[PDB]
Amino acid sequence: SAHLQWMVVRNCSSFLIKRNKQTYSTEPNNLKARNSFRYNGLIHRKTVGVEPAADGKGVVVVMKRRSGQRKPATSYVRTTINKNARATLSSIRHMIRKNKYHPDLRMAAIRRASAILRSQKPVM
Amino acid sequence: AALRPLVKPKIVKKRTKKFIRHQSDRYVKIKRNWRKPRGIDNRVRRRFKGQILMPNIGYGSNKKTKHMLPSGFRKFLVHNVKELEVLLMCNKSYCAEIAHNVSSKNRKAIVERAAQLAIRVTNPNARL
Amino acid sequence: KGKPHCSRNPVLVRGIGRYSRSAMYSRKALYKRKYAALATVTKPVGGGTRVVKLRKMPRYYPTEDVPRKLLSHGKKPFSQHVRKLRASITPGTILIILTGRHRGKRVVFLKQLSSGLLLVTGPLSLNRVPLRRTHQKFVIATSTKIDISGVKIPKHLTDAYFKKKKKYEITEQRKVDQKAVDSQILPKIKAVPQLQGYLRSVFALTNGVYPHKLVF
Amino acid sequence: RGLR
Amino acid sequence: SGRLWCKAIFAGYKRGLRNQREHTALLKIEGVYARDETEFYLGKRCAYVYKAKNNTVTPGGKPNKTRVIWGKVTRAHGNSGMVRAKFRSNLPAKAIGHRIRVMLYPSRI
Amino acid sequence: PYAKTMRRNTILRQARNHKLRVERAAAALAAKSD
Amino acid sequence: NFAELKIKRLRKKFAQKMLRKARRKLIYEKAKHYHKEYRQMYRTEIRMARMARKAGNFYVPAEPKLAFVIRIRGINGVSPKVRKVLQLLRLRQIFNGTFVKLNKASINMLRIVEPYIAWGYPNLKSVNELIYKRGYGKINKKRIALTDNTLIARSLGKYNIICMEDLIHEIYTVGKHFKEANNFLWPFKLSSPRGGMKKKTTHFVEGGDAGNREDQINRLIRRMN
Amino acid sequence: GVDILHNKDRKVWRKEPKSQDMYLRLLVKLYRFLARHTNSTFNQVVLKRLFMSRTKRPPLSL
RNA sequence: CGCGUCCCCCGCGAGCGCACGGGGUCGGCGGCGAUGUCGGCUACCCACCCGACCCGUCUUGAAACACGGACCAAGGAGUCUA
RNA sequence: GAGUGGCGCGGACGCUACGCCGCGACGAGUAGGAGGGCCGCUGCGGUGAGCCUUGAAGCCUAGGGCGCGGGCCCGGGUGGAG
């Protein structure tokens, strides 16, 4: 369970990276990238993750499915969104609110997605 | 221009000089590194007028401005590009400082990756 | 509908009404004043019509934000500030300009402008100073006055007129308004004797002169 | 009630 | 044309006897020799004008060698007409017994 | 909240007293013309 | 339905408003009563002294009930009996102040910490000045500023002291619940005397500024408040 | 500049269990909420007893 | 400052606005700008004012006409078992 | 509190709970006692898909900074294998 296998990995995990009075976690589905019970991408049943696409353009929204959770090859559903900035974020807000899938991660997922799109956008 | 921080409060410091060790002036054996004097007659220890100052917790900096660089950012120390995507979302308050023993060919990858991610580097044009 | 009558009770001292709330009930006559009990505008398009929204959502969110402030009360913007005159600054009083390029020059005060800056004119025929603005705390109001009771200062010269647009060249408007106003002040200074030469002279501190004794 |  | 500042002799520092406080400076303005003669100078601006080796930009024209530390008269000090002032950085102690300028232009007349 | 009432009454009472004292001085000025 | 729900919440809010206005009116009318009580208190002693002098007899008035005690000397080199009495009065710091009501018990406690305190009989003005400017309550053992009346009303509601004018009345006219109103007030952290002292060490009678300063304590209250 | 003895300024009771036992630590998490958010005194007694050493929470016989 | 009603004497009106109101804001301005100037507290050198006796140790009491210490680097002293 | 009768698809930050936040009083100190060290040294089990001949340790430095401090991190030089 969540609170159980938090008390194991809160201080003694591979991903934990302590220096300069700052604590991050390099987890494959952490968004805001920090040591927390909320944003940890391994603990929970429900998990949302935003990555840059396999190619240059687009993002990839990763949804951890309810059913089989000791089943890591089939545990994650990946979808790509290569649209305009507003229509990319609107799709994410409609995936997270209108499924009632981690509504506390809605705003953090839109901020991360926006940062990924602003990153893959050329410099003058 | 520069990559400006999210807030610029004016970083007030209670003291600017170091706390030099007692009788570090005279002896080359005595380092400048601080050591609390525990001698039974020591002037510095029993706080005589116009001697070397001893550190207290009173000198402690504001919790808002603590570890904050003159610019307004806070440092994070980075060895490879896998340790930047950590800072991606901590962007406006935190900045990367690429370590001493990272090779030239890896600095030219970290700064050309941090330029894309819009993360500040404090030592961007080191070796070249 | 109803014409708003200005405050029925006067002000005795700041924050304090003249009349109490029993007097005031009768004063307003409330014994015969008793009472009982957008977003998406549509647009026609050349396969149907569309629903646009003025104020539609942002495309970019920044990675970190600042929250909203708390609420304070007495923090007004500069346009709405109450403007003081120092009592000695009477329209027609001969000031002594202290700070800028024209420091030590004695100059006739015309009127307090809308932003608290003194509109001031040492006649350009005498002092070589135009229709210029000054600050109250950078002058000395002397006990020297001439009667400016009648003459009409142009109204179009105000705090927006004197603002630096962004070498500087004197407009013909400025020169007409200068000789327009000064043609009405020159006969008033040339009335009282030795006064034009007094304005032409420059204020200075000598040996044995302490300002704490001199009445000026 | 005595306001009415 | 002529002078537009009263002449204040920088007497020394705000102090007890065996403990001086350099943040406040004691001014002796010439002519004023009482506490009922120094109401005029309270709040006025003070300048320690000096000149040093290198060129430093001037507000109003050419880069000169001249420099300033702006102050401000705060209080009257003692019974016989001396004045406390406070400067943007502490005055140098080489200035003791040297001229500083009492201005007129936070003017109250 | 009674402070407002006391202050208003005090200012009005002082004003009336000053007016009466000024009138008495005016009566003295009348007597000194007489 | 919700039309009913918000109507009920609006009613309960309006009920809370009219309860506020009713209490507020009680604060106004009690302050008007206390004003009338103080003026007739003041007039009476002038009347009684006049009718005494008209007959040719004397009017010895009431020996005062209320004292204001200021600690003038510090923490260093102090006797244990003088220590215990000073911390029983709650004068644990130089230039701390408390009101103590005079009886037989308290006067014989005052005269044994005599050289460490400067005390006397306060004025109505001084009692107003001290409790309005330096008024802090001992609410949850925490020194909290009396900015509102909902501190005094919530703490001293049981004794019918619901405002600042009630507090000042119960202190000045030494009433029933002086103990629970004086112990509510955190000891008054006064400034240094502006104008200086005469002499700290000796008695008031022999030039100094220690011991009983009968009506002259109000002057010391002005310079330290 | 005030005469207080600071001997007894700190209080020497437990605010947390010394044990790094996670199951005990989740029970303490669970009963800190109930001690705070109920006017029950039972939850305050049980929470306090969850902190105490083995020599202070002894074995009750059947 | 409604009467429709409870004494001995003679329970939801409506707005708008100003603010001595649970901690500062401006819907105010003005200069100077590419090898000669702007900023850089800390840090190198120097000057001036104030303060300022040399550490360690035993001692009631150490700057002591009390003892140890010319200077520098590396080693160097509450450990393990019952 | 609850029942039966009389258009527009929107809403900042948060909560390493061993965390974050709010309010009040306080702060000398030898011998001595306790706590916290993201103070430092050397080796072992884990771990960083760590760093490194495109230059590791070490050393020097009027360079840039952080920390109340123990200390530490970058820049330049030397050095050549950790």
mmCIF file of N, CA, C and O (backbone and C1' of nucleotides) in Angstrom, chain I residues 7 10 35 56 73:
data_model
loop_
_atom_site.group_PDB
_atom_site.id
_atom_site.type_symbol
_atom_site.label_atom_id
_atom_site.label_comp_id
_atom_site.label_asym_id
_atom_site.label_seq_id
_atom_site.Cartn_x
_atom_site.Cartn_y
_atom_site.Cartn_z
ATOM 1 P P C I 7 -49.081 44.773 29.783
ATOM 2 O "O5'" C I 7 -48.410 44.138 31.082
ATOM 3 C "C5'" C I 7 -49.149 43.931 32.305
ATOM 4 C "C4'" C I 7 -48.586 44.794 33.412
ATOM 5 C "C3'" C I 7 -49.353 46.074 33.709
ATOM 6 O "O3'" C I 7 -50.430 45.796 34.605
ATOM 7 C "C1'" C I 7 -47.018 46.534 33.536
ATOM 8 P P C I 10 -49.574 58.061 40.739
ATOM 9 O "O5'" C I 10 -50.487 58.793 39.655
ATOM 10 C "C5'" C I 10 -50.319 60.184 39.300
ATOM 11 C "C4'" C I 10 -49.708 60.304 37.923
ATOM 12 C "C3'" C I 10 -50.050 61.570 37.153
ATOM 13 O "O3'" C I 10 -49.188 62.645 37.511
ATOM 14 C "C1'" C I 10 -50.330 59.675 35.749
ATOM 15 P P U I 35 35.156 53.612 -26.594
ATOM 16 O "O5'" U I 35 36.042 52.334 -26.248
ATOM 17 C "C5'" U I 35 37.479 52.411 -26.223
ATOM 18 C "C4'" U I 35 37.954 52.702 -24.819
ATOM 19 C "C3'" U I 35 39.378 53.236 -24.694
ATOM 20 O "O3'" U I 35 39.474 54.250 -23.693
ATOM 21 C "C1'" U I 35 39.201 51.118 -23.616
ATOM 22 P P G I 56 44.457 30.700 26.178
ATOM 23 O "O5'" G I 56 45.411 29.523 26.671
ATOM 24 C "C5'" G I 56 45.462 28.283 25.948
ATOM 25 C "C4'" G I 56 46.505 27.348 26.518
ATOM 26 C "C3'" G I 56 46.384 26.969 27.980
ATOM 27 O "O3'" G I 56 45.339 26.030 28.186
ATOM 28 C "C1'" G I 56 48.633 27.435 27.501
ATOM 29 P P A I 73 53.099 24.046 10.271
ATOM 30 O "O5'" A I 73 53.468 22.645 9.607
ATOM 31 C "C5'" A I 73 53.351 22.471 8.187
ATOM 32 C "C4'" A I 73 54.091 21.242 7.706
ATOM 33 C "C3'" A I 73 53.621 19.894 8.240
ATOM 34 O "O3'" A I 73 52.481 19.452 7.505
ATOM 35 C "C1'" A I 73 55.979 20.004 8.352
#
